Amino acid sequence: SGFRKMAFPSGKVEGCMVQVTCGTTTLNGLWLDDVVYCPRHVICTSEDMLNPNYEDLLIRKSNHNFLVQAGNVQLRVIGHSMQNCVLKLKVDTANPKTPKYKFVRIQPGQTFSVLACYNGSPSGVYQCAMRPNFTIKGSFLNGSCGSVGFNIDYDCVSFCYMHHMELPTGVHAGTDLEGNFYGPFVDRQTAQAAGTDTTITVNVLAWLYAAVINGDRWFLNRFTTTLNDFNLVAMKYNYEPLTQDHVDILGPLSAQTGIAVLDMCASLKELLQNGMNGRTILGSALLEDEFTPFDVVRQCSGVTF
Amino acid sequence: SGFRKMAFPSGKVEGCMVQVTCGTTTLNGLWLDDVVYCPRHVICTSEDMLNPNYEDLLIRKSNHNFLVQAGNVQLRVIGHSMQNCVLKLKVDTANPKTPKYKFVRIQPGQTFSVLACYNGSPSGVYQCAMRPNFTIKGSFLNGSCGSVGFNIDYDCVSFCYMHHMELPTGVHAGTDLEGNFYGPFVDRQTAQAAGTDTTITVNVLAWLYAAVINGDRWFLNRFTTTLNDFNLVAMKYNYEPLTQDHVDILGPLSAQTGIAVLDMCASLKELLQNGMNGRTILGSALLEDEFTPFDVVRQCSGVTF
Ligand SMILES: *C(=N)[C@H](C[C@@H]1CCNC1=O)NC(=O)[C@H](CC(C)C)NC(=O)c1ccc(-c2ccc(OC)cc2)cc1Cl
Ligand SMILES: *C(=N)[C@H](C[C@@H]1CCNC1=O)NC(=O)[C@H](CC(C)C)NC(=O)c1ccc(-c2ccc(OC)cc2)cc1Cl
């Protein structure tokens, strides 16, 4: 096809992954400057995970109870603090591989790369999207907590995600790098319901736009529509209501492809009702919503770092 | 679902990507020890690409005609040589970031990660598979030549691919790190037909096996079959004939899932004939063949580096 789900080069982020062990529990940590960030439920035993009292379990723990390993070397913890749901460990050495970074909280629909880590060593990288119900559909096993989601632009690394748990529906939930969970989720072993998920509409439109340059044009039609009428049929199929803001982001894409945004909305409208009839767009037989407009522009123009 | 296409951490490979400019043409290079590897058609002008005579165009070029840039620093070329279809540039400095590496030629069906590069700076990483017709379905633009495909195990980096061109059907063709093209392809601007592609059967079986642990079990049935009868229906649907060797690789997977290999073949057989009926396995509405058995084991057990 010529279009793939591709993640940022994980070079900068690999230099910050460390191992954090507390008692018998071990997970990944993010070593930036002289601080290491990790999920706070590292101080939890298997019995404590059913209903923890984190402020009560933390005070029992001390600096020497936290062992940080950066590969085969040891870090010495000279202070600890709880910020919401992340643990902050102050070490005596500043990470020589700390990049120009930034702690951001992303919005639903936005994408980011995930460096899946186990025991502080990188395992794999993949692209992910913040679902509108504030979950992510990742690939995580036990010991994956502490892995981070990040974006990179030019030279800066924006850490936006840290992994914490898996929901009963198999999806995943985590926090930003300040400990605040994405969504109405808490860190304890209880049945937690994610809301009714939806489809990021502006993302599907950017994907259909990407398909036009890459050869697939069979879904294109000659019908057009209006912004309202599209939203009326988008509500029924569990899609986000497109706004004038959404159209403005799809703007430069429509100027390159030469097909107006409202024309593209009509093609998706008919794709929504008429189905796919067994055909494929860009190799997929479903409608992809994990490509932002900026993602489509980045891959069809080749922005590097 | 709990299963994603995830590429190796690209940290080691980013340390070897350099820029190579010859005349007005520029592409990516791979800097290992004191040698830089790059596609040989860097010595080609736009007119020369229609039918080059590489040995005749090379002798006109000299050391000072090759400028290698490792970021903002310059490398000095102290010798050049043509190995098949790759150019070898000997520099005066050994790359300090050279990892433990190895030059391998992979077989059809095998997967590898691709670090897409432009002007010697990494742009993105994604998973790819060597199609049985010796093409790959990648995501490449102009200036992407010189990007490499690689696998990583424990600590070693096995470079298996270097990008060279795009075929009329939108797929891609390249060489190993010794210049030998994968398939019957040459480096010139002419209509080149890739053969009739097929579906890596042992890969689809490993994917259905991955779906079993991850929750999807609706495609499972109670019919069983034999190795022959499966192959007879695999030929008609353009699938590789499964061999006793293929079954042996799917062995440890069948022992974990507790379902024999031949039972799994019957389920794919019915999936092949009866279709999908609109259902989805692991979120996809098609049968994925870019997951090797070893890939499925690696992600369902968490092998790190
Ligand atoms: C971190 N290392 C680890 C990664 C998890 C585990 C496997 N896959 C992942 O993403 N994180 C955890 O184990 C956390 C720890 C909490 C204290 C934050 N817990 C969970 O991930 C978790 C929480 C609740 C349930 C659950 C499911 C269904 C229920 O009823 C049907 C009840 C509770 C499961 C899990 Cl894995
Ligand atoms: C490397 N930087 C560059 C990357 C290509 C270009 C865009 N996408 C890619 O993968 N490599 C090339 O441009 C090479 C150079 C050769 C001398 C190896 N060429 C091609 O990629 C190429 C070759 C032939 C055709 C072609 C297609 C159809 C035809 O008739 C229908 C005839 C020729 C196209 C291309 Cl892009």
XYZ file of C-alpha atoms and ligand atoms in Angstrom:
682
model
C 0.000 0.000 0.000
C 2.707 2.435 1.067
C 1.348 3.392 4.508
C 2.205 1.701 7.800
C 1.776 2.178 11.531
C 5.252 3.440 12.423
C 6.522 4.556 15.827
C 9.093 7.197 16.671
C 12.731 6.079 16.895
C 13.037 4.903 20.492
C 16.739 5.750 20.881
C 16.341 8.644 23.312
C 13.819 6.822 25.510
C 15.926 3.654 25.826
C 18.583 5.712 27.612
C 16.178 6.444 30.484
C 14.745 2.985 31.240
C 15.871 1.527 34.581
C 14.817 -1.276 36.915
C 13.037 -0.523 40.199
C 12.592 -3.213 42.858
C 10.688 -2.802 46.135
C 10.499 -5.924 48.251
C 9.584 -8.751 45.897
C 7.863 -6.477 43.346
C 9.828 -5.122 40.391
C 8.857 -2.822 37.518
C 10.333 -0.294 35.100
C 11.429 3.235 35.890
C 12.062 6.385 33.877
C 15.397 8.000 34.785
C 15.411 11.715 33.928
C 18.141 13.947 35.405
C 18.497 12.857 39.074
C 14.920 11.555 39.441
C 13.407 8.177 38.569
C 9.666 7.922 37.893
C 7.771 4.662 38.376
C 4.219 3.493 39.149
C 3.548 3.770 42.868
C 2.049 0.271 43.197
C 5.591 -1.080 43.355
C 5.236 -0.867 47.160
C 2.298 -3.288 46.968
C 2.278 -6.974 47.823
C -0.125 -9.357 46.094
C -2.492 -9.115 49.071
C -2.233 -5.310 49.211
C -3.304 -4.888 45.571
C -6.920 -5.775 46.419
C -7.397 -2.497 48.338
C -4.243 -0.482 49.100
C -3.768 2.508 51.402
C -0.788 3.977 49.566
C 0.031 6.753 52.038
C 0.044 4.138 54.821
C 2.129 1.584 52.905
C 4.613 4.224 51.730
C 5.642 5.522 55.160
C 6.705 1.999 56.150
C 9.141 1.977 53.214
C 12.516 3.733 53.336
C 15.229 4.850 50.925
C 17.197 1.604 51.289
C 14.009 -0.330 50.443
C 14.182 1.122 46.897
C 16.858 -0.435 44.674
C 17.282 1.195 41.254
C 19.345 -0.603 38.602
C 20.504 1.138 35.416
C 21.616 -1.945 33.537
C 24.364 -3.551 35.613
C 25.040 -0.438 37.715
C 23.286 0.588 40.929
C 21.623 3.918 41.693
C 21.499 5.225 45.265
C 18.131 6.631 46.354
C 18.564 9.775 48.459
C 14.864 10.661 48.786
C 11.356 9.520 47.852
C 7.983 11.200 47.386
C 4.499 10.271 46.176
C 3.004 12.473 43.449
C -0.556 11.211 42.923
C -0.008 7.721 41.474
C 3.680 7.847 40.462
C 6.654 7.343 42.765
C 9.528 9.834 42.577
C 12.971 8.521 43.552
C 15.804 11.044 43.882
C 19.174 9.520 42.947
C 22.747 10.763 43.364
C 23.668 10.629 39.651
C 22.076 12.569 36.810
C 21.329 10.340 33.826
C 24.014 11.143 31.213
C 21.505 10.127 28.515
C 18.743 12.511 29.618
C 17.363 14.145 26.450
C 15.567 17.434 25.995
C 12.209 16.329 27.390
C 8.803 17.637 28.433
C 5.909 16.247 30.498
C 2.639 16.603 28.571
C -0.944 15.426 29.025
C -2.418 14.407 25.683
C -6.095 14.610 24.597
C -8.255 11.721 23.361
C -7.525 10.896 19.742
C -3.860 11.859 19.922
C -1.303 9.165 19.146
C 2.022 8.276 20.744
C 4.682 5.579 20.649
C 5.014 3.025 23.452
C 8.343 1.453 24.431
C 7.272 -1.793 26.101
C 9.796 -2.610 28.828
C 10.451 -5.491 31.220
C 13.012 -5.433 34.058
C 14.224 -2.055 32.793
C 15.339 -3.359 29.398
C 13.448 -2.395 26.224
C 11.365 -5.158 24.644
C 9.579 -3.501 21.719
C 8.007 -0.324 20.391
C 4.630 0.272 18.748
C 2.159 3.037 17.955
C -0.811 3.680 20.235
C -3.724 6.093 20.536
C -5.562 7.570 23.513
C -9.079 6.225 23.045
C -11.926 8.689 23.734
C -12.779 6.652 26.858
C -9.222 7.365 28.112
C -7.963 3.806 27.663
C -5.332 2.509 25.270
C -5.322 -0.786 23.376
C -1.734 -1.837 24.025
C 0.313 -5.030 24.296
C 1.374 -5.483 27.922
C 2.292 -8.421 30.165
C 3.172 -8.678 33.845
C 6.151 -6.512 34.728
C 5.373 -4.056 31.910
C 4.355 -1.299 34.340
C 6.728 1.646 34.165
C 6.849 1.610 30.368
C 6.180 5.065 28.969
C 4.434 6.574 25.969
C 6.166 9.408 24.175
C 6.208 11.686 21.152
C 9.293 13.239 19.548
C 9.516 16.456 17.523
C 12.821 17.626 16.025
C 14.829 16.909 19.185
C 12.423 17.078 22.157
C 10.818 14.030 23.780
C 7.315 14.547 25.198
C 6.512 11.832 27.735
C 2.728 11.536 27.922
C 1.989 8.055 29.301
C 3.135 5.615 31.975
C 1.594 2.157 32.164
C -0.245 1.028 35.297
C -2.869 -1.678 34.784
C -5.104 -3.730 32.496
C -8.896 -3.386 32.510
C -11.335 -6.339 32.484
C -12.027 -5.712 28.776
C -8.339 -6.289 27.983
C -7.596 -2.604 27.328
C -5.042 -0.650 29.352
C -5.002 2.357 31.669
C -2.194 4.578 32.879
C -1.201 8.040 34.036
C 0.680 11.043 32.768
C 4.156 11.690 34.154
C 2.561 13.550 37.090
C 0.638 10.525 38.386
C -2.823 11.700 37.298
C -4.654 8.770 35.719
C -6.109 9.106 32.239
C -9.810 8.573 32.873
C -11.804 7.515 35.944
C -9.367 4.749 36.907
C -7.577 3.979 40.178
C -4.660 1.652 40.909
C -6.145 -1.336 42.718
C -7.195 -4.872 41.803
C -10.909 -4.332 41.281
C -13.321 -4.600 38.364
C -13.119 -1.168 36.705
C -15.422 -0.314 33.805
C -14.128 1.823 30.976
C -16.854 3.877 29.345
C -18.473 3.176 25.991
C -15.691 3.665 23.462
C -16.097 5.589 20.207
C -14.234 6.082 16.923
C -12.003 9.136 16.477
C -13.658 10.612 13.391
C -11.014 13.188 12.426
C -8.498 10.322 12.509
C -10.491 8.138 10.095
C -10.804 11.099 7.733
C -7.038 11.629 7.809
C -6.597 7.918 7.057
C -8.922 8.040 4.042
C -6.956 11.104 2.944
C -3.730 9.102 3.254
C -5.299 6.369 1.116
C -5.919 8.826 -1.733
C -2.250 9.644 -2.320
C -1.274 5.987 -1.855
C -3.541 4.713 -4.671
C -6.788 3.630 -3.009
C -9.585 5.804 -4.402
C -12.521 3.403 -4.858
C -14.301 4.713 -1.751
C -14.320 8.187 -3.312
C -17.696 9.274 -4.646
C -19.521 12.243 -6.180
C -22.182 12.979 -3.571
C -20.843 15.591 -1.093
C -22.781 16.518 2.064
C -22.961 19.015 4.935
C -21.241 19.050 8.317
C -24.504 18.524 10.203
C -25.861 15.641 8.090
C -22.496 13.907 8.519
C -22.621 14.289 12.299
C -26.191 12.942 12.374
C -24.997 9.739 10.682
C -21.795 9.749 12.747
C -23.684 9.633 16.054
C -25.555 6.490 15.002
C -22.335 4.656 14.073
C -20.516 5.693 17.291
C -18.222 8.320 15.787
C -17.064 11.614 17.243
C -19.062 14.659 16.084
C -16.860 16.543 13.647
C -16.428 20.205 14.575
C -15.223 23.248 12.678
C -11.972 22.798 14.604
C -11.678 19.223 13.301
C -12.202 20.453 9.728
C -9.454 23.057 10.148
C -6.937 20.355 11.115
C -7.913 18.349 8.021
C -7.390 21.558 6.029
C -3.842 21.297 4.659
C -4.507 17.651 3.791
C -7.495 18.601 1.622
C -5.393 21.279 -0.096
C -2.722 18.741 -1.071
C -5.156 16.043 -2.220
C -7.322 18.698 -3.885
C -10.543 17.212 -2.463
C -12.525 19.314 0.006
C -13.078 18.104 3.563
C -16.858 17.945 3.151
C -16.502 15.780 0.036
C -14.384 13.339 2.052
C -17.004 13.236 4.818
C -19.618 12.057 2.309
C -17.410 9.155 1.205
C -16.980 7.981 4.802
C -20.731 8.430 5.312
C -21.420 5.963 2.505
C -18.618 3.691 3.718
C -20.354 3.777 7.104
C -23.740 2.717 5.693
C -22.936 0.645 2.592
C -20.108 -1.225 4.319
C -16.921 -2.413 2.675
C -18.300 -5.151 0.363
C -15.096 -7.130 0.927
C -12.793 -4.472 -0.530
C -9.765 -3.144 1.363
C -8.366 0.348 1.967
C -4.581 0.473 2.489
C -4.611 -3.271 3.143
C -7.070 -3.068 6.052
C -10.678 -4.274 5.973
C -11.730 -1.945 8.809
C -11.639 1.816 9.318
C -8.471 2.875 11.152
C -8.726 5.685 13.708
C -5.213 5.576 15.226
C -3.706 7.933 12.618
C -3.975 11.620 13.452
C -3.874 14.247 10.686
C -0.366 15.175 11.838
C 0.607 11.498 11.627
C -0.596 11.305 8.019
C 1.287 14.489 7.095
C 4.417 13.244 8.875
C 4.536 9.991 6.895
C 3.539 11.440 3.501
C 6.235 14.144 3.766
C 9.006 12.464 5.791
C 9.613 14.549 8.916
C 12.774 13.331 10.660
C 14.576 13.906 13.958
C -7.014 -7.373 21.941
C -3.602 -7.540 23.592
C -1.457 -8.205 20.501
C 0.222 -5.573 18.336
C 2.757 -5.270 15.540
C 5.784 -4.122 17.536
C 9.303 -3.462 16.260
C 12.613 -3.923 18.029
C 13.953 -0.958 20.016
C 15.847 1.033 17.396
C 18.421 2.513 19.795
C 21.449 0.594 18.532
C 20.643 1.182 14.857
C 20.143 4.945 15.255
C 23.799 5.229 16.273
C 24.919 4.020 12.830
C 22.787 6.158 10.490
C 24.762 8.766 8.527
C 24.233 10.981 5.490
C 25.950 10.205 2.178
C 26.004 12.750 -0.655
C 27.465 12.175 -4.129
C 27.045 15.071 -6.516
C 23.451 16.226 -6.165
C 22.159 12.835 -4.952
C 21.924 12.121 -1.229
C 20.805 9.046 0.716
C 21.336 7.263 4.026
C 24.368 5.264 5.070
C 25.094 2.618 7.686
C 28.257 3.412 9.665
C 29.757 0.259 11.195
C 33.341 0.368 12.523
C 35.355 2.336 9.907
C 33.093 1.474 6.946
C 29.883 3.100 5.720
C 27.427 1.057 3.642
C 24.992 2.712 1.236
C 23.088 1.858 -1.961
C 25.382 2.183 -4.959
C 22.911 4.210 -7.052
C 24.031 7.289 -5.139
C 26.505 7.862 -8.002
C 23.568 8.105 -10.420
C 22.079 11.232 -11.946
C 18.408 11.362 -12.915
C 19.344 10.590 -16.527
C 21.680 7.747 -15.515
C 18.958 5.919 -13.560
C 17.227 4.824 -16.783
C 20.088 2.429 -17.643
C 23.286 2.769 -15.583
C 26.716 1.228 -16.150
C 27.796 1.264 -12.511
C 31.391 0.124 -13.022
C 31.797 2.894 -15.619
C 30.142 5.607 -13.512
C 32.065 4.601 -10.379
C 35.582 4.989 -11.789
C 34.813 8.621 -12.649
C 34.060 9.267 -8.965
C 36.799 9.778 -6.371
C 37.166 9.803 -2.591
C 36.587 13.563 -2.339
C 33.361 13.119 -4.342
C 31.893 11.188 -1.371
C 30.882 13.362 1.591
C 29.722 11.459 4.684
C 27.987 13.378 7.482
C 27.410 11.854 10.926
C 25.001 14.455 12.230
C 26.860 17.769 12.200
C 30.325 16.192 11.938
C 32.161 15.196 8.760
C 33.690 11.817 7.936
C 36.732 11.592 5.661
C 36.560 8.873 2.999
C 39.923 7.136 2.581
C 38.789 4.459 0.106
C 35.786 3.185 -1.853
C 34.728 -0.138 -3.355
C 31.670 -1.634 -5.051
C 30.333 -4.886 -3.582
C 27.508 -5.991 -5.892
C 24.878 -3.273 -5.369
C 26.112 -1.574 -2.170
C 28.847 1.046 -1.937
C 31.538 0.619 0.724
C 33.173 3.815 2.004
C 36.206 3.466 4.280
C 36.416 6.318 6.806
C 39.165 7.418 9.197
C 37.078 7.120 12.393
C 35.471 3.995 13.812
C 31.874 4.613 14.866
C 31.920 4.822 18.692
C 28.310 3.569 18.672
C 28.992 0.414 16.645
C 27.103 -2.432 18.361
C 27.732 -6.153 18.297
C 26.373 -6.797 14.807
C 26.097 -9.471 12.128
C 25.257 -9.465 8.405
C 22.542 -12.040 7.673
C 20.405 -12.984 4.678
C 16.881 -13.818 5.799
C 14.437 -16.290 4.166
C 10.933 -15.501 2.886
C 8.430 -15.333 5.717
C 10.911 -14.017 8.268
C 10.172 -10.649 9.851
C 12.399 -7.702 10.720
C 12.163 -4.107 11.892
C 12.776 -1.202 9.508
C 14.213 2.137 10.647
C 12.988 4.532 7.956
C 15.606 7.256 7.514
C 15.925 10.497 5.554
C 19.123 12.574 5.275
C 20.761 10.253 7.806
C 18.333 11.070 10.618
C 15.813 8.471 11.832
C 12.188 9.118 10.877
C 10.272 6.087 12.157
C 10.370 2.364 12.830
C 7.924 -0.390 11.886
C 7.701 -4.154 11.482
C 8.095 -5.752 8.058
C 8.185 -9.212 6.503
C 10.070 -10.671 3.547
C 7.259 -11.672 1.204
C 7.667 -15.040 -0.568
C 8.191 -13.126 -3.839
C 11.194 -11.406 -2.179
C 9.546 -7.992 -1.903
C 8.543 -6.091 1.214
C 5.457 -3.937 1.741
C 7.094 -0.949 3.413
C 6.520 2.791 3.797
C 9.211 4.634 1.837
C 9.529 8.031 0.143
C 12.274 9.632 -1.927
C 15.550 9.785 -0.031
C 14.651 6.707 2.043
C 17.292 4.552 0.334
C 19.995 3.489 2.764
C 17.508 2.648 5.509
C 18.162 -0.813 6.902
C 16.134 -3.721 8.225
C 17.377 -5.452 11.341
C 16.652 -7.984 14.060
C 17.984 -7.899 17.626
C 18.533 -10.829 19.995
C 19.834 -10.292 23.539
C 22.540 -7.827 22.473
C 23.413 -8.565 18.819
C 22.000 -6.635 15.856
C 21.485 -8.642 12.654
C 21.265 -6.306 9.662
C 19.340 -8.127 6.938
C 17.955 -5.434 4.616
C 18.951 -2.199 2.894
C 16.388 -0.263 0.881
C 16.930 0.385 -2.827
C 13.778 0.949 -4.881
C 10.000 0.773 -5.264
C 8.312 -1.603 -7.712
C 5.438 -0.620 -10.046
C 2.974 -2.417 -7.741
C 3.964 -0.106 -4.870
C 5.945 -2.781 -3.004
C 9.650 -2.414 -2.248
C 12.883 -4.208 -3.111
C 16.322 -4.113 -1.546
C 19.509 -6.025 -0.845
C 21.271 -7.677 2.041
C 24.285 -5.918 3.538
C 26.478 -7.557 0.868
C 24.702 -5.903 -2.072
C 22.906 -9.027 -3.320
C 19.314 -8.107 -4.149
C 16.460 -10.041 -2.583
C 14.741 -11.518 -5.625
C 15.204 -11.027 -9.376
C 15.523 -7.240 -9.115
C 18.164 -4.827 -10.418
C 18.812 -1.177 -9.565
C 17.616 0.817 -12.565
C 14.519 2.815 -13.492
C 12.621 0.194 -15.463
C 9.329 -1.653 -15.080
C 10.231 -4.676 -12.931
C 7.628 -7.349 -12.210
C 7.577 -9.024 -8.829
C 6.274 -12.573 -8.988
C 2.845 -13.743 -7.877
C 2.820 -13.210 -4.122
C 1.520 -15.766 -1.626
C 0.536 -15.933 2.048
C 3.047 -17.229 4.602
C 0.989 -20.082 6.038
C 3.095 -20.897 9.113
C 2.812 -17.203 10.022
C -1.001 -17.171 9.857
C -1.085 -20.280 12.043
C 1.137 -18.589 14.627
C -1.205 -15.584 14.534
C -4.303 -17.716 15.139
C -2.352 -19.328 17.978
C -1.650 -15.870 19.414
C -5.373 -15.099 19.201
C -6.214 -18.097 21.400
C -4.322 -16.853 24.458
C -5.557 -13.293 23.878
C -9.269 -14.235 24.037
C -10.382 -14.769 20.438
C -11.496 -18.393 20.094
C -14.596 -18.230 17.869
C -12.688 -19.492 14.819
C -11.806 -22.646 16.763
C -13.773 -25.714 15.724
C -14.054 -29.463 16.322
C -13.235 -30.883 12.895
C -9.467 -31.601 12.685
C -7.817 -32.635 9.401
C -4.608 -34.010 7.875
C -1.481 -32.247 6.646
C -2.143 -33.176 3.017
C -5.828 -32.162 2.890
C -4.828 -28.810 4.400
C -2.163 -28.250 1.749
C -4.640 -29.145 -1.013
C -6.951 -26.356 0.183
C -3.975 -24.076 0.863
C -2.779 -24.217 -2.753
C -6.158 -23.021 -4.033
C -6.190 -20.005 -1.687
C -2.566 -19.023 -2.488
C -0.964 -20.206 0.747
C 2.412 -21.819 1.305
C 2.336 -25.633 1.543
C 2.858 -26.507 5.191
C 5.726 -28.946 5.727
C 6.753 -31.161 8.617
C 9.405 -28.522 9.313
C 6.699 -25.842 9.544
C 4.743 -27.992 12.015
C 7.838 -28.429 14.192
C 8.235 -24.647 14.519
C 4.575 -24.360 15.553
C 5.292 -27.108 18.097
C 6.004 -25.269 21.359
C 3.069 -22.957 20.628
C 0.664 -25.906 20.401
C 2.056 -27.289 23.670
C 1.328 -24.031 25.509
C -2.149 -23.524 24.032
C -2.861 -27.246 24.418
C -4.346 -27.504 20.906
C -2.523 -29.666 18.367
C -1.102 -28.134 15.195
C -3.348 -30.209 12.929
C -6.447 -29.061 14.826
C -5.406 -25.449 14.214
C -4.928 -26.140 10.496
C -8.556 -27.275 10.232
C -9.802 -24.017 11.763
C -7.846 -21.958 9.227
C -9.125 -24.272 6.482
C -12.708 -23.389 7.391
C -11.766 -19.729 7.841
C -10.330 -19.926 4.322
C -13.546 -21.314 2.800
C -16.360 -19.987 5.008
C -14.840 -16.505 5.213
C -15.006 -14.197 8.199
C -18.753 -13.359 8.234
C -17.880 -9.869 9.481
C -16.226 -11.059 12.695
C -12.719 -9.965 13.705
C -9.680 -11.811 15.073
C -7.377 -9.680 17.256
C -9.037 -6.562 15.852
C -8.213 -7.371 12.216
C -10.734 -8.437 9.572
C -8.076 -10.171 7.449
C -5.602 -12.982 8.079
C -2.215 -11.610 9.158
C 0.921 -13.352 7.882
C 3.621 -10.939 9.124
C 3.946 -12.617 12.546
C 6.415 -15.488 12.689
C 6.083 -18.200 15.352
C 9.114 -16.705 17.106
C 7.415 -13.296 16.994
C 4.307 -14.702 18.687
C 6.399 -16.412 21.376
C 8.453 -13.245 21.899
C 5.387 -11.085 22.570
C 3.436 -13.627 24.655
C 6.457 -14.211 26.930
C 8.253 -10.838 26.934
C 11.794 -11.385 25.651
C 13.853 -8.231 26.226
C 17.266 -6.873 25.244
C 2.485 -3.859 35.975
N 3.570 -4.411 35.998
C 1.240 -4.639 35.855
C 0.898 -4.827 34.342
C -0.583 -5.474 34.107
C -0.602 -6.710 34.441
C -0.689 -7.665 33.025
N -1.015 -6.899 32.008
C -0.987 -5.401 32.543
O -1.223 -4.428 31.925
N 0.151 -3.893 36.544
C -0.823 -4.560 37.451
O -0.771 -5.739 37.655
C -1.905 -3.701 38.116
C -1.514 -3.330 39.555
C -2.606 -2.407 40.167
C -2.474 -2.295 41.672
C -2.562 -0.998 39.489
N -3.195 -4.350 38.183
C -3.871 -4.810 36.975
O -3.372 -4.653 35.926
C -5.282 -5.474 37.074
C -6.256 -4.834 37.838
C -7.554 -5.389 37.947
C -7.856 -6.573 37.284
C -9.301 -7.189 37.388
C -9.872 -7.703 36.259
C -11.142 -8.248 36.309
C -11.842 -8.268 37.507
O -13.128 -8.818 37.561
C -13.581 -9.343 36.369
C -11.272 -7.751 38.635
C -9.996 -7.203 38.586
C -6.887 -7.206 36.510
C -5.587 -6.652 36.400
Cl -4.350 -7.496 35.398
C 16.027 5.950 -2.694
N 16.276 6.997 -2.124
C 14.893 5.848 -3.631
C 13.611 5.433 -2.839
C 12.357 5.066 -3.819
C 11.883 6.120 -4.372
C 10.368 6.481 -3.668
N 9.954 5.440 -2.980
C 11.156 4.398 -2.969
O 11.168 3.342 -2.450
N 15.224 4.821 -4.657
C 14.971 5.033 -6.109
O 14.478 6.048 -6.509
C 15.352 3.914 -7.086
C 16.710 4.192 -7.747
C 17.086 3.003 -8.677
C 18.216 3.359 -9.621
C 17.440 1.742 -7.822
N 14.393 3.729 -8.151
C 12.997 3.420 -7.864
O 12.634 3.314 -6.754
C 11.990 3.188 -9.037
C 12.369 2.328 -10.065
C 11.486 2.074 -11.143
C 10.237 2.683 -11.169
C 9.245 2.395 -12.356
C 7.922 2.207 -12.068
C 7.020 1.947 -13.083
C 7.457 1.870 -14.398
O 6.547 1.605 -15.428
C 5.236 1.476 -15.019
C 8.780 2.054 -14.685
C 9.687 2.315 -13.666
C 9.854 3.533 -10.135
C 10.736 3.788 -9.056
Cl 10.216 4.899 -7.734
